[PDB]
Structures are given as C-alpha cells and as structure tokens.
Amino acid sequence: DTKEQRILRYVQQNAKPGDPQSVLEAIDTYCTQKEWAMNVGDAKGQIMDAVIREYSPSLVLELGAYCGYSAVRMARLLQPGARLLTMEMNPDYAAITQQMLNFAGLQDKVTILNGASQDLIPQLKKKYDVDTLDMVFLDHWKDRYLPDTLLLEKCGLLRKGTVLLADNVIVPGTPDFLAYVRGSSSFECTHYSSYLEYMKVVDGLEKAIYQGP
Ligand SMILES: CNc1ncnc2c1ncn2[C@@H]1O[C@H](/C=C/CNC(=O)c2cc(-c3ccc(F)cc3)cc(O)c2O)[C@@H](O)[C@H]1O
Ligand SMILES: [Cl-]
Ligand SMILES: [Cl-]
Ligand SMILES: [Cl-]
Ligand SMILES: [Mg+2]
Numbered sequence: 593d594t595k596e597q598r599i600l601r602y603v604q605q606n607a608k609p610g611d612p613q614s615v616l617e618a619i620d621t622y623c624t625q626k627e628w629a630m631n632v633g634d635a636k637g638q639i640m641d642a643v644i645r646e647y648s649p650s651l652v653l654e655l656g657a658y659c660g661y662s663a664v665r666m667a668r669l670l671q672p673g674a675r676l677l678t679m680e681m682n683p684d685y686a687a688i689t690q691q692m693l694n695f696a697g698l699q700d701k702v703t704i705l706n707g708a709s710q711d712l713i714p715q716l717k718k719k720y721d722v723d724t725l726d727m728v729f730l731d732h733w734k735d736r737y738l739p740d741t742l743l744l745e746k747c748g749l750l751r752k753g754t755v756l757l758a759d760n761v762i763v764p765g766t767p768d769f770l771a772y773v774r775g776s777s778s779f780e781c782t783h784y785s786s787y788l789e790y791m792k793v794v795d796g797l798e799k800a801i802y803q804g805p
Contacts (some may be wrong), residue, residue: 594684595627595629596629596658596659596684596685596688597617597684597688598626598627599622599623599627599629599659599688600659600688600691600692602618602619602622602626602717602764603618603619603692604616604695606618606621606622608791609649609695609696609697610696610697611696611697612664612665612667612668612696612697612698613668613746615664615692615695615696616637616661616664616665617635619631619659619661620629620633620634620790623789623790627739628698628702628789628790628791629632629658629659629789630789631659631661631662631789632661632662632665632731632759632784632789633660633787633788633789633790634664634789635660635786635787635789636660636747636759636786636789636797637665637785638729638797639784639797640662640665640666640729640757640787640797641665641669641784643755643757643797643799644669644670644727647725647727647755648671649660649670649674649676649727649755650671650673650674650726651674651675651677651722651724651725651726651727652666652670652674652675652677652725652726652727652728652729653677653678653679653725653727653728653749653756654666654676654677654678654679654728654729654730654788655678655679655709655728655729655730655736655740656679656680656709656729656730656731656732656733657678657680657685657686657689657704657734658677658680658685658687658731659685659688659689659692659754660688660690660691661692662729662731662759663676663678663689663692663693663698663704663795664692664693664696664698665681666729667693667696667698667701667702668696670701673693674701675702675703675778676701676702676703677702677703677716677720677722678702678703678704678705679705679707679708679709679712679713679732680704680705680706681706681707681708681709681732683706683802685762686704686705686706686804687706689704699741703720707787709732709736709740709743710736710739710740710743713740713743713744713747713749714747716747716749717747717748717749718752722747723747723753724749724750724751725744725750725751725754726751726753726754726755727754727755727756727757728741728744728750728755728756728757729759730756730757730758730759730766730769731758731759731760734760734764734765734766734769735766735768737758737766737768737769738766738768738769738772741756741769741772741773743774744761745802745805749804750802751804752802752803753801753802754801754805755799755800755801755802756773756779756798756800756801756802757797757798757799757800758770758797758798758799758800759795759797760795761795761796761797762785762794762795762796763793763794763795765789770798773798773800776793776799776803777803778802778805779800779801779802779803780800780801780803781798781799781800781801782798782799783797783798784796784797784798784799785797785801786802
C-alpha cells in the first residue's frame with residue numbers, strides 16, 4: 593500500500609464525484625495534513641490556472657501525471673472540445689491518474705497514455721493524428737525537460753506561439769533546460785516566482801513561448 597494509493601483513497605472517502613474542485617481540495621488537504629507529495633499544489637496551481645485561462649489552449653500535452661492533480665487542474669479549465677494528452681510512464685500512477693480524472697468527471701477531456709515521453713512523443717502525429725500542440729506542461733524527471741523540448745521540436749509538434757510551462761525551475765531545479773530556453777532566440781521566457789507545494793520554500797514556473805525555427 594503506497595502513498596499514492598492512500599491519496600486516491602482519501603479523495604474517494606472525502607471528495608464529491610463530478611466535482612473537480614472538491615478533488616483538488618481533498619488532495620491538498622491530505623498532502624498538507626497527512627503526507628507531503630509532489631503535486632504542483634495550490635500556490636503554483638493558481639498560476640497555472642491564470643496561464644491556461646489567458647491562452648485558452650485547444651490541445652495541451654502534460655509530461656508526468658503522477659496522481660493526476662495537475663491533469664484535474666488543467667482539464668477543468670479547458671473549453672468545450674479542447675483536449676489534454678498526458679504521459680505517465682509508471683503504470684500504477686497512470687491508473688491512479690485515470691481513476692482521479694474519472695472521479696472528477698473529466699475523462700472525456702483527457703487521454704492518459706501509460707508510457708515514457710521519449711517513446712510516445714514520436715508517435716503523436718501518426719498514431720494520435722496530432723498536428724501541433726498549443727501548450728506543454730513539463731513536470732516529469734527534471735533532467736528530461738531539455739531532452740524532451742528538443743524532441744518535441746524535432747518531431748514538428750511545436751508551432752510559433754506554443755506555450756511551454758515548466759514546474760520546479762528553482763527546486764529541485766532544471767538547470768540545463770532553464771539556461772537553454774533563456775539563452776535561445778527560439779523561446780521568449782517569463783518567470784513566475786511561487787512556492788514549493790505545501791512548503792514555505794521558493795519555487796517557480798517558467799513560461800517559454802516557442803518562436804519557430
Ligand atoms: C522521462 N519520461 C517520462 N515520461 C513519462 N512519465 C515520466 C517520465 N519521467 C518521469 N515520469 C513520471 O513523472 C513523475 C515524476 C516527476 C518528478 N518530479 C520531481 O522529482 C519533483 C520533485 C519535487 C521535490 C521538491 C523538493 C524536494 F525536497 C524533493 C522533491 C517537487 C516536484 O514538484 C517535483 O515535480 C512521476 O509520476 C513519473 O513516473
Ligand atoms: Cl483554442
Ligand atoms: Cl530566450
Ligand atoms: Cl501549495
Ligand atoms: Mg513538480
């Protein structure tokens with residue numbers, strides 16, 4: 593019995609089916625009062641919400657679902673017909689994420705793919721009929737942010753204007769990615785200072801808007 597399964601059970605015992613805000617609240621409660629977990633959390637989540645509402649993306653890719661917190665967060669703000677694709681390599685976590693989304697009533701807006709981003713990204717055009725992505729949320733292994741950004745470009749999945757939004761650019765940090773996007777003429781970057789989930793420790797999100805090749 594794992595921490596992730598305990599979070600899911602707590603949501604099943606304390607939230608309301610079909611109510612995404614009650615799911616977010618239950619997770620945040622559990623992780624504040626019982627056991628910390630690496631969800632984006634409410635402080636950074638509010639910044640994500642503001643960014644999503646600003647750009648109104650039709651197709652979002654999430655790298656690293658974990659328990660599904662950010663997938664609930666983002667999916668609840670998508671317009672009718674807009675979609676989220678989320679990649680999660682750990683089969684147990686993929687199942688928790690799907691169950692979380694089902695409980696929240698958001699399943700029609702999301703596709704949870706159980707595999708590693710480096711294997712799945714090259715399949716998005718052929719298998720999933722994706723043209724380009726409007727937004728990418730990076731929240732998987734930190735040493736994979738830069739490799740996967742470069743892969744997304746190689747596969748033709750970024751357009752002029754695609755919004756990348758990266759968690760944890762301060763803690764744990766993603767130093768190669770952050771240096772790269774800030775130094776590159778192909779990205780216009782904005783830093784949003786915030787706090788590590790459930791902690792009084794500075795963290796931040798980076799927005800990096802692709803400018804084309
Ligand atoms: C590499 N390709 C991949 N493709 C698909 N899924 C992938 C994946 N890599 C990892 N994953 C999945 O993403 C998730 C991993 C995320 C890694 N996150 C962190 O390490 C992390 C770590 C902290 C953290 C902060 C402070 C601290 F003291 C300790 C930890 C905070 C966060 O917000 C984090 O996001 C898991 O669900 C994992 O199975
Ligand atoms: Cl749109
Ligand atoms: Cl730049
Ligand atoms: Cl928080
Ligand atoms: Mg994170």
